[PDB]
Amino acid sequence: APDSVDYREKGYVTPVKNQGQCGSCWAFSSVGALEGQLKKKTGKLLNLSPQNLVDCVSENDGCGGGYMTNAFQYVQKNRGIDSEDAYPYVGQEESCMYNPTGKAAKCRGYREIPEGNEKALKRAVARVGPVSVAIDASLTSFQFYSKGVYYDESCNSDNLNHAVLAVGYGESKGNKHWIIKNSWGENWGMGGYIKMARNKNNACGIANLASFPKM
Ligand SMILES: *[C@@H](C(=O)O)[C@H](O)C(=O)N[C@@H](CC(C)C)C(=O)NCCCCNC(N)=[NH2+]
Ligand SMILES: [Ca+2]
Structure with missing residues (x-):
């Protein structure tokens, strides 16, 4: 694998969305990964609908939460x-x-x-391409993150609670990172994004629940 990749630079990533108060992070994470594969396979970059997943993915619980794998399984069964x-x-x-x-x-x-x-x-x-992952997003420091490579030792790899999209990886100031697209709007973090410490003993559990759809 290359030393760094950034799918935003290749046009595989749609603009940052805002999930609001609904617990639908899993839906935004899922459509993000499907959007990546769609562009890679067709050349079109298009917003796919998280509402479709929220209302219809019955293995999940709508605004009360869900998993990305269940969402991909829905799209397969539903044929679209x-x-x-x-x-x-x-x-x-x-x-x-x-x-x-x-x-x-x-x-x-x-x-x-x-x-x-x-x-x-x-x-x-x-x-x-972009891969759906889940992290511990519960810390005050994550929520007020603004820039740089994020790392907080209190992050708990066994307490996954927020689904995001890994759209790349790299290194800043000698600190390796993942480029993570969140769904809290473009004002949050670095234009709605966060660089999260990479190769630091699976910080925040970023590799504990990752998956991607086949297309
Ligand atoms: C994330 C968010 O909106 O910030 C959102 O609350 C969410 O869905 N969290 C997931 C956990 C991550 C994907 C690790 C969630 O909690 N999944 C479990 C939901 C319970 C399942 N109930 C039904 N019927 N399937
Ligand atoms: Ca399932």
Whole structure:
């Protein structure tokens, strides 16, 4: 794998969204990974709809939370997911209103990254594209993060609670990092992004629940 990669630079990443108060981080994380694969396979960069996943992925619990693997499994079974235009985010649970006419991507399965393995994660990011991951996002320091490579020793790898998107990795000031796209709006962090310490004993559990959709 290359020393660094940044998928934002290749145009594989849509703009930063804002999930609001709904517990739908898992939906934003999922469409982020599907959006990456869509661009890589078609050349089109398009917003896919997290609302579609929130209302329809019945293995999950809407605004009460969910998993990305369950979301990819839904898109495969359903034979598609709508675009954001065809199924707009409203930040609260509604009945399923999927319309195949608005279908913008498909999914033929998903793959998990070996638990805790940051090197497999790096290679997945290098080979595949943006990868859905989960972290401990509960610390005050994460929430008020503004710039630099994030590291806080109180972060708990066994307390995953927030799903994000790994869109690259690199190194700043001799500190290795992952480039992480969050869903708290473009004002948060560095334009809605965060560089999180890489190769520091799986900090924040970034490699504990990673996965990506097959397309
Ligand atoms: C994340 C967020 O909006 O900030 C959001 O609360 C979320 O979904 N968290 C996940 C945990 C990460 C993906 C590690 C969540 O808590 N999943 C478990 C939800 C409980 C499942 N219930 C049903 N019926 N499946
Ligand atoms: Ca499942």
